[PDB]
Amino acid sequence: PLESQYQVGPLLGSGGFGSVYSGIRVSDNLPVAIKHVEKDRISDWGELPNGTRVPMEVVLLKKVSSGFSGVIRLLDWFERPDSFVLILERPEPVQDLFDFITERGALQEELARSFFWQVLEAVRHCHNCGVLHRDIKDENILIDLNRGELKLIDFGSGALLKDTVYTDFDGTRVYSPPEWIRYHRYHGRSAAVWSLGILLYDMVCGDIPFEHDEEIIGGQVFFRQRVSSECQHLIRWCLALRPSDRPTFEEIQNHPWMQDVLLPQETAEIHLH
């Protein structure tokens, strides 16, 4: 029983995360986030490891929530007549990366490097678990301000990871790759790398590079802030127009700009406290 197992508090983020409420697990006073999704509103369904019909979001969350990772973990879930209820970790204190960048402006490259690295490791974790997020953006990244750890959220546009072509997409269009805009076809890993290029530009420049379809497919990256040549090179490589010209995750993490990353605790002490 939901109300009998959790103390439920007020809405988190005034609805900006969805129907997500603050909560406390009564059995141990653990802080949780309680997310509600309406059955009528669910476009994509899947089967749990035991065949139960649940939202795809639950399928993917369950697949990535085993062990520690840079993903907000699903601790439990419940089915109601008209909805599903998801019990998630709630780190505290937190700020999402969109608000963090708005308030601080373009990030120092040392800080962007640490953040981007943690995002790469978290996306690699998802892929290793068979999960494609399909909506990587600063709004879907939480910063644990005390621990310096980044956490991926919102698998509501995700999919099981496959090596064949995707012809559906419901993520954020300004993070989506040119082959999606032009042909409505993309492969998972190279599309993710494109979105990561958008995210990295966002971090070091203070906002995303493209707002319009013509800019996404145009292939020109103007840098509006001072950005090192090594960082510009990585960004432009991630934003190669043709997917086969983009780096793999291995090539991103071996890139010269990515070397000598800070540890999460160092990141918190230097940049967040």
């Binding site: 969109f98 708005t102 909506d135 953006k137 709004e139 919102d154 509501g156 546009s157 419901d170 993520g171 954020t172 269009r173 300004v174 993070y175 203070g206 906002d207």
Partner: peptide, 8 residues
């Protein structure tokens, strides 16, 4: 320059 969120 305006900066904004984008819906999914």
């Amino acid at each position: 320059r305006k900066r904004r969120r984008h819906p999914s």
